[PDB]
Ligand binder design. Structure first.
Ligand SMILES: *[C@@H]1O[C@H](CO)[C@@H](O[C@@H]2O[C@H](CO)[C@@H](O[C@@H]3O[C@H](CO)[C@@H](O)[C@H](O)[C@@H]3O)[C@H](O)[C@H]2NC(C)=O)[C@H](O)[C@H]1NC(C)=O
Ligand SMILES: *[C@@H]1O[C@H](CO)[C@@H](O[C@@H]2O[C@H](CO)[C@@H](O)[C@H](O)[C@H]2NC(C)=O)[C@H](O)[C@H]1NC(C)=O
Ligand SMILES: *[C@@H]1O[C@H](CO)[C@@H](O)[C@H](O)[C@H]1NC(C)=O
Ligand SMILES: *[C@@H]1O[C@H](CO)[C@@H](O)[C@H](O)[C@H]1NC(C)=O
Ligand SMILES: *[C@@H]1O[C@H](CO)[C@@H](O)[C@H](O)[C@H]1NC(C)=O
Ligand SMILES: *[C@@H]1O[C@H](CO)[C@@H](O)[C@H](O)[C@H]1NC(C)=O
Ligand SMILES: *[C@@H]1O[C@H](CO)[C@@H](O)[C@H](O)[C@H]1NC(C)=O
Ligand SMILES: *[C@@H]1O[C@H](CO)[C@@H](O)[C@H](O)[C@H]1NC(C)=O
Ligand SMILES: *[C@@H]1O[C@H](CO)[C@@H](O)[C@H](O)[C@H]1NC(C)=O
Lengths: 328, 175, 326, 175, 328, 175
């Protein structure tokens, strides 16, 4: 034959990418993709474009009540998720039991509107009650005995504590978060020394909320030099609804309320990861993830539309041919 | 593989061929040169691209806050939360690892099938006008110029045109 | 060579059905079946052959208490699931908190035996206490002031409200649901106007139940022209067990109890879907699903042995060959 | 598709053959007509019927009411209920979509094998007594009447009977 | 034509093993393996090499409180899981309510260290109160009236019940579990017969715990020949923290505490399956599972690293060829 | 199956061959016997071994206690716990059953491909020096002794050595 040649063959290159199959492993292929997202920017970013709320040295309990070390942050306009730190100690300086702490955090994780206003002004609401000496040594402010910024510790005005009765109606047209505290003194002498009365009561009542409180007086172990306890309570008020306060003592009256609109449930990230100016749609405590891959291995705890977390370290998906550049 | 073309009767691949996955290597009086089949390679490109998007874009996730917070007297529901988290983790990890294992070789068998089909496409054209010297190659019994080579690559080889010339060389070789 | 020919080929038809594959999309096929159930009959059918319980205008709280608008308690019957409506508003007419309302709804979702009997007859159990003037304006019955059908509001008979202690032993042989209430007035004058004594207590106790109730007197914002509140409670009594009611005032004694046997935990469907006479094994708020297909997209909240819910709009599976005419 | 039979060296399918999935088309002096290979067709029907039943009849679900009701103070466990429901939704949606993609490709390749092997059956049966004219057709080098056509289908082709006749017919046109 | 032949074929054996494919069922194969684990040893072995805590006649309430019948049960310093029997009715002999009982059972399911110590020594802690007459007919021991071993029912000494205030500081170095009880007598005459004073209060106080109880006196139906009730309470004390008990009656003071170190959340098995001396890494109520298979159908309620539970009855995975020994 | 080798053009298996999965049967003047091709059998053995281990070792579960205890007022979260456990059981049962239903079909087709390739390897090693009598058998036009047979099984068959003898035998037989 007048020798002419035509062969059929396949591509090869210098790729060292290795994939695995059910029958074979360490198969070197020409081209491949990684189906597992395994890297993050290492920054806390803004879900849906909305920046998060970072509390720093304070936790949510300290931030919502106004601990003296708090409120130095950038107040609040709106946020997608709440960020604390592994050392966010400064919260309830006065020992006590914050009622439904975990449930409140879920509600506050994401908000559309959030404005703070003085629901009960200090100067023109408590004429017969002393809203000036209600401070404690357990809540210092640069060495000065202070108290929560959003709460007022009402005590007797010399020797007079009349039956307090103050009410408020939700004019804002939104949900209003109201927080108040109940003081439980150590000794019965401390009861009269602060409220001038022996057997007192506190009542808070709305159209749905109705509960009465009787102080429980006993000596507890010293916590930040405090043998008494102060349990903090909270509730939400529907628009155009009256909330009634009626106490003869041992009531930490609200001073600042919050008119807010709650979003769908979000998360709370606790990490030392810094916050920068990036958007992302997937956020993890390690960092933010910007990928279209269906799987990730950065952190099981994710907020937002995120890839499903897997324990895999390599999901190399073969797309090209078997790489055979040299036949031995 | 599964069809015996890649790493089979074609022992290795061509480093020189860089314009596609599957192709030809001709050599005649004018010269030689690697040239990829632009139809099968493009068809394989569409399939594998659709393969990756099928796995990726079938995942449909919503906004979800995985983390949960529980107090000192909510250990039971806390453990239930981890059973949901760990259970979801175990399900996805098993599926993801085996999905890659299943599809990887299916892609490799897909490439093995495409190469063999290309060999059968050319073989069904040349018939006895060419001699199968093996290793994925054909030796022509007639003179195939550059225009003749393109007809095979175009899938329009004219067997009747060269049948008489191949007939004479085939039996002259026999004697 | 007469040119006789034999050819090998495959089927083709007018089928325009398309199926997606891992490598290709559309791919018209000759024969295919849909693995996804995407249609419903739009009816709320009898699940397990047992008809459901449609409260209609009322909700669960009003039905079990006996609100004047909540028809009656039917007869000795049973149901497979409870049907409410978005418009169902008739419930606790007097403002208050139904304690463990969510839990009681799940327990009452499906029962196989049910019967309402007068545990404490009105005119043969409370001689010393008035059992006729215990009504309020917030609970109308065709215009007039009334109260719950299954509950009695006991007040002083003129000026006499002595100690009360009435007990019942569960002779029914089944679990008995006992519901009561505690009244919390606005002012102590209202407390005297109703129960004479201004310092009363309520104690309810069975073999397992042991709790003592103290009223709270304070002024609350008016809800349906009531500044007072009335919380409602419930418990279950084993057969051959005694429950004790002991109160000197502020107690809403039960009139009708419920002897019942509970099923496994079922669901409650809240939708405006009409109820017709039909049988099904899967029930959703949108409608019933009568299929053996493993997947569905009608509604994620299913009740019964149901296909898994998926977001897929189409899950057609290829069974025939690639339709290649022409 | 993977074996090259369907949409390959047999480009199109027959709309006239309705008595099966794979079959024959004959033509002689007596007449023509389409006849389906009932043996191979029934094998595919049984397999595909099992294929549908295998996917459907492995879904073993129990009685379950998804409906859960949580009060305004139980938002945390309420989210856990939705995390479970969303997680189950994502798992089943992803698996159901990919399962359809897998078995649709398997079904098409399974049909490709049946068509390819049916052609291989006749090709290995007629041997050189017929000429491969392409497009899944054979041209007989002898008089294949109706009885001869049935013999190939109900595979009983008496190759020795026509072997000597086809030997002379092949050489005559070879001149 | 010389005649020599060479043939290519596949192996066949006498195996009747059958597998299922998506297109065919009951396909006889030459070689196969089982992917489903259906074999259990029928014994309760030791997860992580740690023997479980078998309670036998009692449940967790009786064992932790010290119900008479729950005497020497294991003693023992650690357990991987707690095993009760389906008929173990010896718990709280005196009727009442165990508060957070399920939570406590989950918390106690597995510990690393466990030390019972006399937190309030009976010989010295109660000189002003009667610590011996506090027995009852509801808690028998060899017929005689007795009470819980770890608790002391304090009653009036003579006709005097002075105010009680005793405290403990966690010097153990681990968490200490402290359990106490509140008694609710049937009649006020019985109240004076036990604690003299007719109006009493009980207070328990730690750095984190602060709650005060008031007895609720009424006649309940006779349960184990008792018209009174006795609620049970428990809490954990952080190391170095002080827990204060204050009451004037109706308080079942602790006598023994538990200095323990907790593990991750384990489970509790209710089964009659015997406990034998075997290790295992997976445990079920029916028995232990020793396998490397990925699936099992023995029991859905597993404890430890266990194969996923499936409804499957037979998962036969083919490894060999299609067995065709003869052709018809 | 999918390749038509096992239970296809080779109707049955060899119960007399015990040293491997796929192999040869020879016959000459020096005797006959069954021998299994060592490389191809080991290739399937290694691949199938990896197939089993891939399914098993990709399952990685952590310590988990499924047992959960709830009181009479925790029915709602108790039913949620069952919804988690029933959901996990339904998912794993469906995946495990279909996984075996799928990889068993792959396993059988894997053996079917291996038999086909072994026939092709020998077929495209003897060429016209042997005649395809069928049923996966070759009849030699020359005399293939024990040394010749071992060369075929070793993949080192010397075609030009026996081609001249096959040339004369083929022509005389095909007279
Ligand atoms: C903000 O957080 C810091 C903690 O990072 C608080 O200061 C710290 O308070 C603790 C607790 O009082 C002090 O530790 C020890 O306290 C006990 C009394 O409980 C005492 O016996 C020990 O001698 C010791 O002081 C700790 O020293 C103290 N300081 C620091 C720098 O950590 C701080 O009070 C918080 N501020 C507010 C407003 O909440
Ligand atoms: C330990 O459990 C048994 C029951 O298993 C208790 O004895 C039972 O007491 C009840 C009281 O209602 C009687 O009805 C039974 O007849 C008794 N059964 C017996 C004696 O076998 C026993 O009291 C429990 N506790 C202690 C501390 O002994
Ligand atoms: C995020 O996107 C918004 C628009 O949706 C844009 O205004 C904003 O600057 C972005 N933030 C970044 C890129 O950090
Ligand atoms: C190439 O093939 C196409 C499609 O069959 C045909 O139209 C065209 O004429 C061919 N050209 C050559 C140069 O072979
Ligand atoms: C196919 O044709 C038949 C007969 O006319 C008709 O009944 C059927 O609906 C057609 N299918 C289509 C158009 O999909
Ligand atoms: C059909 O095939 C069967 C099975 O081999 C055989 O017994 C029969 O004689 C055949 N008949 C015809 C007419 O080909
Ligand atoms: C097959 O025969 C062997 C002995 O040759 C024996 O060990 C084995 O049990 C037999 N198995 C079956 C299934 O007959
Ligand atoms: C269990 O494993 C431990 C590991 O130290 C070993 O000492 C012990 O003998 C083993 N016991 C049994 C019963 O397997
Ligand atoms: C068998 O083939 C190998 C190469 O695969 C060669 O080295 C060897 O010499 C051959 N013969 C024998 C007897 O091993």
């Amino acid at each position: 034959d007048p020798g002419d040649t035509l062969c059929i063959g396949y591509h090869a290159n210098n790729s060292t990418d290795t994939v695995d199959t059910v029958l074979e492993k360490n198969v070197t292929v020409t081209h491949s993709v990684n189906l597992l997202e395994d890297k993050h920017n290492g920054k806390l970013c803004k879900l849906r474009g909305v920046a998060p709320l970072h509390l720093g040295k304070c936790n949510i309990a300290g931030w919502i009540l106004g601990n003296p070390e708090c409120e130095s942050l950038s107040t609040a306009s709106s946020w997608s998720y709440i960020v604390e730190t592994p050392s966010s100690d400064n919260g309830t300086c006065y020992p006590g039991d914050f009622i439904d702490y975990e449930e409140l955090r879920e509600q506050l994780s994401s908000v559309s509107s959030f404005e703070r206003f003085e629901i009960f002004p200090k100067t023109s609401s408590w004429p017969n009650h002393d809203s000036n000496k209600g401070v404690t040594a357990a809540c210092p402010h640069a060495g000065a005995k202070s108290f929560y910024k959003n709460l007022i510790w009402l005590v007797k005005k010399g020797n007079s504590y009349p039956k307090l009765s103050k009410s408020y109606i939700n004019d804002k047209g939104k949900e209003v978060l109201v927080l108040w505290g109940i003081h439980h003194p150590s000794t019965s002498a401390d009861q009269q020394s602060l409220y001038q009365n022996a057997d007192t009561y506190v009542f808070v009542g709305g159209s749905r909320y109705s509960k009465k409180f009787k102080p429980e007086i006993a000596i507890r172990p010293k916590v930040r030099d405090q043998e008494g306890r102060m349990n903090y309570y909270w509730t939400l008020v529907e628009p155009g609804d009256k909330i009634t306060f009626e106490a003869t003592g041992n009531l930490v009256v609200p001073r600042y309320a919050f008119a807010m609109e709650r979003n769908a449930g979000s998360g709370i990230i606790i990490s030392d990861t810094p916050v920068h100016d990036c958007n992302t749609t997937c956020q993890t405590p390690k960092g933010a993830i910007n990928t279209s891959l269906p799987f990730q291995n950065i952190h099981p705890i994710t907020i937002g539309k995120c890839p499903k977390y897997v324990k895999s370290t390599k999901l190399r998906l073969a797309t090209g041919l078997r790489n055979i550049p040299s036949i031995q | 593989g599964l069809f015996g073309a890649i790493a089979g009767f074609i022992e290795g691949g061509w480093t020189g061929m860089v314009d596609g996955w599957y192709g030809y290597h001709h050599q005649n009086e004018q010269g030689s040169g690697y040239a990829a089949d632009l139809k099968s390679t493009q068809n394989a490109i569409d399939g594998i691209t659709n393969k990756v998007n099928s796995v990726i874009e079938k995942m449909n996730t919503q906004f979800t806050a995985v983390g949960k917070e529980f107090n000192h007297l909510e250990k039971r529901i806390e453990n239930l939360n981890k059973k949901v988290d760990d259970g979801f983790l175990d399900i996805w990890t098993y599926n993801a690892e085996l999905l890659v294992l299943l599809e990887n070789e299916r892609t490799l068998d897909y490439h093995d099938s495409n190469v063999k089909n290309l060999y059968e496409k050319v073989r069904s054209q040349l018939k006895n006008n060419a001699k199968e010297i093996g290793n994925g190659c054909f030796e022509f019994y007639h003179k195939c110029d550059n225009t003749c080579m393109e007809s095979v690559k175009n899938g329009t080889y004219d067997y009747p045109k060269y049948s008489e010339e191949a007939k004479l060389n085939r039996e002259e070789i026999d004697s």
